[PDB]
């Protein structure tokens, strides 16, 4: 009974946590911005987030409307070279 990431954040704010007047962006960048305050920039993260920093958005990896808090994305969901999480 795990709650989605979008949920965990909601309880900590609402649907407006990554949505303006309930109007999801039609790109992804606009949202990716929201994930740049209480957290920071990938270029300011581990050596695992850096490598990506400037490639794919958070959600893109931390599928909010799908993933569930406490669920480390799988590299197999992109990398097929045995890539493993560190
Ligand atoms: C950030 C932590 C989010 C919160 C809080 C909620 N949603 Fe969300 N939603 C988020 C992203 C990043 C995206 C897409 C942009 C991307 O980077 O891919 C979305 C998209 C939606 C959609 C799209 C509908 C579709 O056509 O698939 C809907 C309908 C939506 N979001 C609704 C929604 C609701 C109801 C929320 C509160 C329960 C909510 N979102 C919170 C990120 C985040
Ligand atoms: C403040 C308004 C926030 C914004 C904007 C975003 N997140 Fe956030 N997130 C916030 C808090 C207070 C916390 C708790 C821990 C912490 O101090 O950061 C979190 C936690 C997450 C996590 C944790 C995942 C886990 O394994 O527990 C993730 C993956 C996460 N947040 C992702 C995320 C995304 C994708 C956002 C934009 C769509 C985003 N955060 C915005 C507060 C805030
Ligand atoms: C896939 C290429 C990812 C993208 C893009 C982002 N993150 Fe991530 N993140 C990823 C993994 C695989 C993990 C866990 C590693 C494992 O397998 O154990 C994480 C973890 C985090 C955490 C945990 C730290 C904490 O909650 O205290 C945070 C806070 C986090 N990721 C935030 C974050 C943000 C803000 C991103 C966009 C700027 C982002 N991640 C992108 C994989 C990926
Ligand atoms: C798709 C959503 C991805 C997921 C899931 C993860 N990564 Fe990724 N990463 C992605 C792309 C598109 C690229 C580069 C694209 C290209 O072909 O140029 C990368 C790159 C890396 C690298 C850099 C390798 C290098 O050349 O030095 C590393 C080290 C890396 N990715 C690690 C990694 C790990 C450990 C993941 C699972 C926790 C992971 N990535 C997931 C896109 C995506």
Curated annotation (Swiss-Prot):
Co-factor: note: Binds 4 heme c groups per subunit.
Residues where heme c 3 binds: 49, 58, 61-62
Origin: domain of life: Bacteria
Residues that hold heme c 2 according to the record = 9, 35, 38-39
The prosthetic group or cofactor this protein requires is: heme c
Q: Which UniProt keywords apply?
A: Electron transport, Heme, Iron, Metal-binding, Periplasm, Signal, Transport
How is this protein named in the record?
Answer: Tetraheme c-type cytochrome
Natural source organism: Shewanella frigidimarina (strain NCIMB 400)
Gene symbol here is cctA
Task: State the covered range within the intact protein.
Answer: 26 to 111 of 111
């Amino acid at each position: 009974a795990d709650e989605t990431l979008a949920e965990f954040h909601v309880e900590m704010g609402g649907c407006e946590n990554c949505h303006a007047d309930g109007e999801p962006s039609k790109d992804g960048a606009y949202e990716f911005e929201q994930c740049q305050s209480c957290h920071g920039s990938l270029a300011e993260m581990d050596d695992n987030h850096k490598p990506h920093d400037g490639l794919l958005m958070c959600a893109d990896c931390h599928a909010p409307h799908e993933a569930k808090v406490g669920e480390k994305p799988t590299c197999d969901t992109c990398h097929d070279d045995g890539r493993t999480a560190k």
